[PDB]
């Protein structure tokens, strides 16, 4: 699991 | 170019006053993901705690109906108010700047990766003042983003905590 804060995306 | 380098950080930024809980209100971004899945946003909460000149930041939000906690470290870049979310493998670094904020009701943060600027509005509690909302949209316009690139997040469904099985640690390299 990863978190891209720029797009508030948890994938 | 680096749009975030032209953004003035909160003068004499005080991490002590910025610490605590912040509720995510909106994001202005040209990110493809938001344009296609923005209407699927989850109530998001941020918890900040000073760690020397850096800031430990936890983000709380649900995923598939379950509360998660993401742990990150906003590193000190040597400039007050500017922080760095270090790159990890093919995952590019994210530059952060705390711009406008009164520490007590709202905060406007800018995030940048690969030269693409994103703007976020946080609030200590709801409702947010009309003044702050209009101010945020003004900053989004100045960031060369349109009204269709502004996404308002849920006002309910926030996560207060997460169990040990739902903690994503993005601090340890």
From Swiss-Prot, chain A:
It is found in: Secreted; Target cell membrane. It comes from the Eukaryota. Heterotrimer of 3 chains: alpha (C8A), beta (C8B) and gamma (C8G); the alpha and gamma chains are disulfide bonded. Component of the membrane attack complex (MAC), composed of complement C5b, C6, C7, C8A, C8B, C8G and multiple copies of the pore-forming subunit C9. Belongs to the complement C6/C7/C8/C9 family. Component of the membrane attack complex (MAC), a multiprotein complex activated by the complement cascade, which inserts into a target cell membrane and forms a pore, leading to target cell membrane rupture and cell lysis. The MAC is initiated by proteolytic cleavage of C5 into complement C5b in response to the classical, alternative, lectin and GZMK complement pathways. The complement pathways consist in a cascade of proteins that leads to phagocytosis and breakdown of pathogens and signaling that strengthens the adaptive immune system. It is linked to Complement component 8 deficiency, 1: A rare defect of the complement classical pathway associated with susceptibility to severe recurrent infections, predominantly by Neisseria gonorrhoeae or Neisseria meningitidis. This is Complement component C8 alpha chain. The lineage of its organism: Eukaryota, Metazoa, Chordata, Craniata, Vertebrata.
From Swiss-Prot, chain B:
SUPFAM superfamilies: Lipocalins. Gene3D superfamilies: 2.40.128.20. It comes from the Eukaryota. Disulfide bonds join 67-159. The keyword Secreted applies. GO terms for cellular component: blood microparticle; extracellular exosome; extracellular region; membrane attack complex; plasma membrane. One of its GO terms (biological process) is complement activation, classical pathway. Keywords: Complement alternate pathway, Complement pathway, Cytolysis, Disulfide bond, Immunity, Innate immunity, Membrane, Membrane attack complex, Pyrrolidone carboxylic acid, Retinol-binding, Secreted, Signal, Target cell membrane, Target membrane. Membrane attack complex (MAC) assembly is inhibited by CD59, thereby protecting self-cells from damage during complement activation. MAC assembly is also inhibited by clusterin (CLU) chaperones that inhibit polymerization of C9. It is found in: Secreted; Target cell membrane. One of its GO terms (molecular function) is retinol binding. The keyword Secreted applies. Heterotrimer of 3 chains: alpha (C8A), beta (C8B) and gamma (C8G); the alpha and gamma chains are disulfide bonded. Component of the membrane attack complex (MAC), composed of complement C5b, C6, C7, C8A, C8B, C8G and multiple copies of the pore-forming subunit C9. Component of the membrane attack complex (MAC), a multiprotein complex activated by the complement cascade, which inserts into a target cell membrane and forms a pore, leading to target cell membrane rupture and cell lysis. The MAC is initiated by proteolytic cleavage of C5 into complement C5b in response to the classical, alternative, lectin and GZMK complement pathways. The complement pathways consist in a cascade of proteins that leads to phagocytosis and breakdown of pathogens and signaling that strengthens the adaptive immune system. Belongs to the calycin superfamily. Lipocalin family. This is Complement component C8 gamma chain.
């Amino acid at each position: 699991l990863r978190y891209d804060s720029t797009a508030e995306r948890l994938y | 170019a680096s749009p975030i380098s032209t953004i003035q950080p909160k003068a004499n930024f005080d991490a002590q006053q910025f610490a605590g809980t912040w509720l995510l209100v909106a994001v202005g971004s040209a990110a493809r993901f938001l344009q296609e899945q923005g209407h699927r946003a989850e109530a998001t909460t941020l918890h900040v705690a000073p760690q020397g000149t850096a800031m430990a930041v936890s983000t709380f939000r649900k995923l598939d109906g379950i509360c998660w906690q993401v742990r990150q470290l906003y590193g000190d870049t040597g400039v007050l108010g500017r922080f760095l979310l270090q790159a990890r493998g093919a995952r590019g670094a994210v530059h952060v700047v705390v711009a406008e904020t009164d520490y007590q009701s709202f905060a406007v943060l800018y995030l940048e990766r690969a030269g693409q600027l994103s703007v976020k509005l946080y609030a200590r509690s709801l409702p947010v003042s009309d003044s702050v909302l209009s101010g945020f949209e003004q900053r989004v316009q100045e960031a060369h983003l349109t009204e269709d690139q502004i996404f308002y997040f849920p006002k309910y469904g926030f996560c207060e905590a997460a169990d040990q099985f739902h903690v994503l640690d993005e601090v340890r390299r």
